[PDB]
Amino acid sequence: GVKNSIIWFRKGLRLHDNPALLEACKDAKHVYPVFVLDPHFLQKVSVNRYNFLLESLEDLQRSFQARGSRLLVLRGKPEEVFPRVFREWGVTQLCFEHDTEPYAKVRDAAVRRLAAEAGVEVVTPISHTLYDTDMLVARNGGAAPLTMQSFTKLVDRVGDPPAPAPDPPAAMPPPAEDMPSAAPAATGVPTWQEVGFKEPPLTVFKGGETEALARLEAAFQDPKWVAGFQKPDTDPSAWEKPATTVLSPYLKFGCLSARLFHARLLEVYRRHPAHSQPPVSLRGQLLWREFFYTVGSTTPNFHRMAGNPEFLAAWREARTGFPWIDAIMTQLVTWGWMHHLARHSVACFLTRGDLYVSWERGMEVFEEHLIDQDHYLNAANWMWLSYFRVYSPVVFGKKYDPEGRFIRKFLPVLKDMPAKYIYEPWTAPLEVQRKAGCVVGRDYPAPIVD
Numbered sequence: 181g182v183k184n185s186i187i188w189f190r191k192g193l194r195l196h197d198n199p200a201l202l203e204a205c206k207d208a209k210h211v212y213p214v215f216v217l218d219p220h221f222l223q224k225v226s227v228n229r230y231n232f233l234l235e236s237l238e239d240l241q242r243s244f245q246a247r248g249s250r251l252l253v254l255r256g257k258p259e260e261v262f263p264r265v266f267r268e269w270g271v272t273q274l275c276f277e278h279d280t281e282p283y284a285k286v287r288d289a290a291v292r293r294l295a296a297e298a299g300v301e302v303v304t305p306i307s308h309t310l311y312d313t314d315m316l317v318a319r320n321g322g323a324a325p326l327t328m329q330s331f332t333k334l335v336d337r338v339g340d341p342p343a344p345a346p347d348p349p350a351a352m353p354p355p356a357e358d359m360p361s362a363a364p365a366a367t368g369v370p371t372w373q374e375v376g377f378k379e380p381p382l383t384v385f386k387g388g389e390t391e392a393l394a395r396l397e398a399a400f401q402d403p404k405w406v407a408g409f410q411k412p413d414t415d416p417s418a419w420e421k422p423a424t425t426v427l428s429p430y431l432k433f434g435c436l437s438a439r440l441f442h443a444r445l446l447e448v449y450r451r452h453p454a455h456s457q458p459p460v461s462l463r464g465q466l467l468w469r470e471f472f473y474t475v476g477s478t479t480p481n482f483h484r485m486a487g488n489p490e491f492l493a494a495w496r497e498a499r500t501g502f503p504w505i506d507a508i509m510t511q512l513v514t515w516g517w518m519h520h521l522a523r524h525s526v527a528c529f530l531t532r533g534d535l536y537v538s539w540e541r542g543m544e545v546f547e548e549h550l551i552d553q554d555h556y557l558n559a560a561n562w563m564w565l566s567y568f569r570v571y572s573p574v575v576f577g578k579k580y581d582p583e584g585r586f587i588r589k590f591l592p593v594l595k596d597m598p599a600k601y602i603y604e605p606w607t608a609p610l611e612v613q614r615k616a617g618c619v620v621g622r623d624y625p626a627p628i629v630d
């Protein structure tokens with residue numbers, strides 16, 4: 181006789197542009213905001229990324245409490261928890277954002293069956309991508325386009341992505357009182373210590389929808405920078421103020437709506453007729469993401485499109501002996517984010533013909549440490565790898581940073597090396613090494629390859 185609904189967060193960790201949340205609140209006597217956390221994640225995942233998620237859930241908790249509700253972090257597996265709470269809470273509707281990843285399809289199909297057995301309606305809107313990816317494939321005749329230029333042609337044919345959804349109401353229907361499965365002590369957001377991590381996170385990027393919107397506003401503080409953006413011309417050695425938006429972790433977890441980002445770019449583009457165009461523009465960057473999601477989700481053998489241990493270990497542990505390479509690998513572990521062309525440098529130095537190895541092994545290392553780790557974006561970018569015309573990937577940074585400021589920041593052992601040798605410290609006169617307190621082979625390794 182009443183509507184009791186669940187809004188289930190997996191991605192889409194936001195209140196803004198959340199059509200699943202708007203549906204669950206409509207005409208609802210009680211709404212249960214749920215995140216399902218697998219407590220036994222022990223089995224691979226850096227504390228930096230997991231803490232980013234926890235911070236994002238803490239932000240959601242604060243947002244829901246401001247509106248008379250709270251987030252319920254349920255422990256267990258969705259297939260076991262949901263049948264119990266469907267009956268306990270008298271649920272009539274279950275809402276959640278659509279997800280096209282492989283595991284998500286298996287998980288969501290099972291939950292859809294359990295909902296039907298309990299008489300629960302399921303509503304799953306598209307809001308993680310700009311477009312309904314299935315719709316794009318259908319309008320392309322039933323096959324995903326295979327080049328960026330062709331893909332940009334198709335979306336231009338389709339038109340603008342949908343507008344961001346309205347903000348939710350200032351007050352929300354709360355969960356019912358004294359429901360055993362909603363008890364606060366069993367449903368709070370845990371800390372990185374409580375989930376089992378021993379080392380603290382070191383990244384400088386904080387999770388959550390609130391920080392995402394703050395960072396988006398900062399990127400749009402200069403419309404001329406947004407209008408003139410060209411990805412290949414940005415500086416990979418810029419760390420104090422990165423040369424790109426660093427919105428990737430926020431888009432990965434859904435703290436930031438891709439649709440809101442796109443709408444804001446078109447606002448700026450209307451007033452700047454000479455703005456950059458795809459693929460180098462900031463809109464092009466969003467379209468790279470959409471392109472790889474579309475191809476990845478509709479391609480069965482997606483990982484097969486691109487056709488010894490010691491070299492990988494040195495690369496993994498930032499001891500290759502090339503300061504530019506080791507500095508980036510240090511940024512990976514410490515920040516979990518590096519500029520696109522820094523990612524290119526270490527990836528080419530690993531796969532494009534310096535250490536050979538297999539690109540899959542390099543992806544595994546990225547998958548552990550990147551805070552923007554994305555099943556589709558990580559793999560696709562490794563394969564699309566297969567710029568250094570003058571500067572080889574091992575001294576690439578010298579073009580932008582002849583003094584080696586980036587290297588000195590992340591490899592402080594080299595902080596007193598004269599700039600003439602900071603990219604090739606093995607060339608320094610051996611008394612220069614002594615003076616700088618950095619002897620090659622003692623304080624910093626010699627190059628691992630001739």
Ligand SMILES: Cc1cc2c(cc1C)N(C[C@H](O)[C@H](O)[C@H](O)COP(=O)(O)OP(=O)(O)OC[C@H]1O[C@@H](n3cnc4c(N)ncnc43)[C@H](O)[C@@H]1O)c1[nH]c(=O)[nH]c(=O)c1N2
Nearest residue numbers: 424425426427428465466468469520552553554557558561
């Ligand atoms: C080896 C390797 C591995 C990865 C990636 C590249 C390479 C070469 N990338 C892509 C890229 O390096 C990354 O998206 C940016 O460095 C993120 O920086 P900004 O958010 O400042 O991007 P910037 O502000 O330039 O772009 C804005 C947004 O567009 C998207 N975007 C930009 N460049 C992209 C690209 N090349 N491919 C797809 N989407 C792109 C992202 O959503 C990004 O947040 C990736 N990206 C990611 O989100 N998760 C990942 O796990 C990886 N892994």
